Amino acid sequence: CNMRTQFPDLRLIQYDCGKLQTLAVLLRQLKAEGHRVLIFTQMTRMLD
C-alpha cells in the first residue's frame, strides 16, 4: 500500500496554516486545564 500510493501525512494541515498552530497550542492547555471550547467560523468549508 505505502509503495502503491502516497497521501498527505496530516502534519502539513497544521504546518501550512499558522493560525492552526496557535489554535493547537491553545486547545492543548485548555484541555490540560479541563475546559471545553466552542470554535466559531463563518465558513462551513473551513469546518472540514
Next chain:
DNA sequence: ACAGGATGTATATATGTGACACGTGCCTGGAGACTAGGGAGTAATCCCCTTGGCGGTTAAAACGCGGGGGACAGCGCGTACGTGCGTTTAAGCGGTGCTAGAGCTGTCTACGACCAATTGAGCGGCCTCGGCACCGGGATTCTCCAG
C-alpha cells in the same frame, strides 16, 4: 435445286440547331482634384450594481404508488383504389397572320429638395388618485360515486 430480280436495313455521308468563342463599339468604371461630415478616439458622468461564502424558510419539484383507461396489435371484412383496356378527346407541334401594346425617345414642366428662418408640438418631470388586484365571504355549479 438454282440464278437472278424485288424488296429492307443497318451503314456511312452531307446537311440542320445550339452553344461556345471571337470580334467590334459605347457605355460604365476608372482615374483625379476638392470639400465637407462622419466617424474614430479619448475623456467625463451616472448608473446601481458587484461576489463568496453561508444561514434560513417556504413552496415548486421531486418521488411513490396505485390504477385505470388508453395505446397497440390482431381479426375481420367490405369497400375501394389501382390495374389494364378499349375509346375519343383534345393537347400540341407547326403553321399563318393581325394588332395591341411594350419599349423607347424626347420635352418640359411641376415637384421635390434644401434652407433659413420660426415656433409649437411633444417629450420628460412630477403629482395624484381611480382602477385593477386580492380578501372574504357566500352562494352556486360541476364532478363523482352510489345507488
